[PDB]
């Protein structure tokens, strides 16, 4: 039996189970899309999987290194020499052209992203925040319009709504995935609601079928904040517009800020294109057709960088899945003792961030001791809920919000270091620290 | 007498006069600031002016090259090999740090810009448009507030006002500089005015002393749109906030989008710093103190590129001034014949764009024949005035606006090719075509 | 314990042992001297050793590249693109100065070399041969004086002695290191002896403590030919003068001919400076104080090139040690079988060349079959001993010389390809041919 | 009548007389040899002399510049940006080859030089000094042999003879050209004399006819020191070997040290080739056929530089002749008043240095006042005669030497700044100082 690896999360998990022998029924080929470039070079020979693949030594370079300390996300580790070499070579081609803002590599990256997402229209933007603001204006959001969203995302999700004058309406998360609870959304719908803005937090997709069911009944749009979820299988099937970020810390990043708007909806795509560049008619600069717009297309220079770095996407995502499975398998004893709750392996998760829950009040102690006693940095994404910031807006509009689940989970969440060029020895050091602090 | 070349417009003009023998007892030294680095290596030795400089042959590489056509702004010509080699060098240093968005080059570029503008506080941003939006919010603009501005700037100026819900109030330009007429500002002030937004159009400064007199009487803020005017002597002396753009077409540009907010006002600088980065407290990521903000700081990668390219700013500004003077001197007869109006040489102008006025209704014919008969591209920055776009906003709010001078000048203006890597042979081709089409 | 990497032989061996995990709980910082520039960039982060270094994959770029032949020293492989980019950068600074022979980079390189060798005085010369000629004059060599030296060096060593009219007196090598046998020196001393000229052949130091013991008894000077040994720890400790070569094939080279004279002795340094420039008093051009001299200082241009290329010296020397250790370890079975003798790993060797001995008279067969059958070039440095040339000098003076060890070793020696930009795949191709030809 | 400009001194004088209108009946073409490249590009169109040549403005960029001070030979002025651009261009092709000592550009430069000199054999060397020493060894000079030479050359001439153990025998110069008096040579021949070493001092050729007549009678070689005289018509007609220097201050220089041996004598040329590289058989490295040799071939990198710089030779020599004529015409009055003696214009002089004689004891006064009062540097090439250095050799061997005309001339000689990129305003400043100090 034969699977063609598409570069997305489902097939990465299927390949991993093959690499580990949890399966032997299956043979693999790999498609020639750009996000598969590195995986194909590293793990395949003549479109056949190499026979002698040692995940520990060949993919993670395991060599019994002695570790002294763990930073959560050392940004030098997120880019490889291979990537740098490719970036320098492409920039030697782009720089003499003098096209750094407008240019032909933006269109190419838009097409690559459009193929990878199976979506007809892509507008590459100067950031995921800008993509979200432009997308909200394209569906007609006016000041005072309400947008339903969770309260545990990065500040950008709420800020894009606020920047255009609209009003966040917070809904509680579910009990299993850190995502907006579909069963709480309907009761928060008012005559002012226009949009549901679910977040695929930490790289895990929301239950989009149920959210679409509700949005159709209420004739609401869905804009999906997928800034942490590139590569997740079937991303965007039910959404009107899907928002990506290509910030450098994302699973796929450029070398600066960038993002994208993705849709099948031609009218919405056209309005996005106009809003993202000053309100001008597309291809008629200086001639406004919308009342205003932003200076929010991607830079040609970053698009060219991104066409190099996206070559590593499926492979780095495969490394993330392996790391996550290792945390799950090696921390299971702490969950069986009912000290922590672990994520479960699912076929949609791309493991941008790896959350655990430390229960019965111990989270701060565990995080503090990991750092002070074992020199392990862990982090909390994010440290303040949307309805709890020290702001005039919160004091004026959000003091009556209670989000029971979100608030309880927030007292328990802790993120563990997980990034694709981490060493297995580094993960072992984290694993030993977590076990030892819970003894 | 001994003068230090500071890298700004006044000293560049004095240097040009000395190179050309219009002043005699003049020694020069060159200040060792980054924007002078190229001028110091090309024209100075032992901190004195080289004796053997020939402007036409050494600065413009005149060779009697044969020219067959002229493009207005071929973007490959705006960056030199020397700049490219330096940009590859600094990319090799920045890329392995993995610092692409936040980073240390952003702070250094802010310090360089603060030194060159003699201002205490600089927030480097993701574009000049973003700089303008943030600055407007920093002075307290709320939806419905009015901003007094001209109607002949690039769309970005009005768009920044509109995107935060404010209302442009358009005032006519003066009769001599394409800038907002100070004598028409006061009658446009209402209870809703919060800011005057003069634009230093084409590289020429507005009459800021008069505008400040009015602003002080009405206790109004001034935000100066200086996106075209970097290098202009005494820029900002009377402004609360100055906006710069480092778009690649500007007199100084990076290799993508960027800009800056410059101020001596610490309160405004702090608010700018918070609104440019999600409303977070300064250095307190994910902890909001303002109600929202944007994702609008410069990319560290672009700051590094800008620290390399700004080395060319004073030298490129000097080449622009010489080109401008050459147009003025060689087209004098067409003005004496009352066919065109020429700019005047002034100490503040950095000649981002070179406007002439074709009078007696001939502008369209001169533009079209220059291209179709003489193979010379000219342009009109900008083709539609702010109150004349076919937008809902204009149809609803601006149909009674009459800006007599702006509208009359708009029928006569034409921009001639002017960019610092032009050949004098290319400028000669322009000049001959302008003379011939006006026989 | 913390060790500062100095960039010399001994600390490179300690660093390689740490990287390979032959020591534990060694931490490293790196000295900020110019010869360590590349090693600091590539291997350290915040003045600590990077945790994620994989020698084969990151330092040698191993990719299982297919190899079909091996050349011994392809000169295009001795210089990297990084070096070229830096050389072009510094040529852009030096060329407009017009300073190409005399100039300030020569001084800077003399200071760098003096700091690296821990010596007070450095005269940078036009070649190592010139450095040795000048040095011999500086210690007072007159025509007819004898200089004790080995017979297995490059011809330059004997040529410098002969060019000033002095007489080589050849002494046999020891049985373990290719270097002059200290126990054979005293018997060759006559009333004419003025200098002992040991050669640190192939990168390995001679036994300088014992040679100094003899020299002191007989009031002899020692000039050390260290032209192959830059970076060897404690070089020069017992020598009056040390000679270096910066020819492009050395462990550190420029892009042309250059070398240096290094000494703590101010009298000799002054006389070297005088003889290396026409016999002129120091800084007194055209005014002789010595009877004559040569035109033998370094070119300023080569000195500037040297300041760029030397940045790679410690890293390239580290790579050479790894390559040497891999030959020793992978060829051990052939020494066990009594087919070959291998060098030992020692803290002083910088591995400019990698000698083995092929015993039982098989050297010529193995060399020829490695080439003809296996497409591997090896070489013999040097093919003719000093007393065995068909020259009038040899036929008149050296026909009674018997140098038993030198002659026997000369029948067995064979150099294997070894240069820092070799691939490990290329070294594997050499290893396989050597194993195979000795089946 | 039609002349084809060959690039040598005679045709340059002819061409100068045409550019000035002192000849009417003469048409010019120019040959396509490398030393004519810049003159052909600058002054010709389709192998015809440009109609419109203004020597002052087109060749000297005369622009009524205001001069403050004169340095005798500022080395930054000896290289043009055109040359620098070409040098960077050729090194971008040379550096990746890794051929920096041995290489193919050396052979090309030898071929260009042999054609320019009309000689069959050229050995490009690491300096002129090295060329001279190798040449003397090639004709069989042994320690104690005598070499007849003048006492007023650069120290290299005598040093090369001394360095190999031979004995300079000084002969007085003539009354008209600073060159060895042929009428005083024969009286200095002893049974030890082996060679006459005339020097083409300051760019002026010695009377080689009468010298060759003497050498034939006595079976002596002639080695001509032409290190200052490249471009001189009919150079080397009568000499066995002609020495060149390509030092960067010469009329043609590289960017470092280099020179050449030029001969028609194949036996000498072969011996020179061997002595210049360690005594090895040609194309048989490491196999000595001579007793010793040097490391004295040109660097391939310098040969590549020289192929770019020699493009400017004929044009720069033309500039020198104009400057020299201009000094002669404008100082004529001082010679008429019997205060100075001036050179006369001749067809062989390439004007490397411009000598005058200040008579009646005033030379020191004029030199000192020119510098103290007028900030004009002049110089004396050379400050000490060969038999007057305070060296042990002079005390032992040359105290009896009296060279009447040399010594008298030496009391009178002063050199005036002359280099091709000098400005005519600079030369005017020198002229004015010279007149004003002599009234
Ligand atoms: C769910 C979601 N929606 C929307 C967005 C907005 O996506 P941009 O507008 O493309 O960032 C984000 C972005 N999040 C990261 C953030 O997690 C942190 O690492 O900090 C970086 C910023 O860190 P630096 O400023 O140091 O790059 C942010 O990019 C996001 O995560
Ligand atoms: C007065 C003023 N205020 C404000 C602004 C806004 O400054 P950013 O936000 O930094 O651009 C500008 C910018 N203007 C140029 C525009 O002239 C044209 O060339 O088009 C480019 C855009 O061309 P590309 O998209 O091809 O870069 C613009 O950058 C400006 O000129
Ligand atoms: C021990 C000793 N002392 C003294 C010397 C003299 O050091 P320079 O005078 O600096 O070379 C040397 C030099 N040796 C090399 C030689 O090994 C060979 O590769 O050939 C090149 C010559 O090769 P090319 O001419 O192709 O560069 C020589 O540089 C030397 O090795
Ligand atoms: C007649 C004659 N023979 C022979 C020679 C020997 O020619 P190389 O061996 O090629 O120089 C020379 C050279 N002379 C100059 C000297 O004039 C002065 O400018 O000083 C420079 C040195 O100045 P720098 O060291 O600063 O380069 C010397 O090169 C020479 O002139
Ligand atoms: Na933006
Ligand atoms: Na030499």
TrEMBL record, chains A, B, C, D:
Residue stretches making up the Oxo-glucose-6-phosphate:glutamate aminotransferase N-terminal domain: 4-66
Modified residues (N6-(pyridoxal phosphate)lysine): 250
Superkingdom field: Bacteria
Keyword RNA-binding applies: no
Molecular function (Gene Ontology), one example: transaminase activity
Gene3D superfamilies: Aspartate Aminotransferase, domain 1, Type I PLP-dependent aspartate aminotransferase-like (Major domain)
Biological process according to GO: polysaccharide biosynthetic process
Active site, UniProt feature: 250 (proton acceptor)
Alphabetical UniProt keywords: Pyridoxal phosphate
Family named by the database record: Belongs to the DegT/DnrJ/EryC1 family.
Name recorded for this polypeptide: KabA
Classification lineage: Bacteria, Bacillati, Bacillota, Bacilli, Bacillales
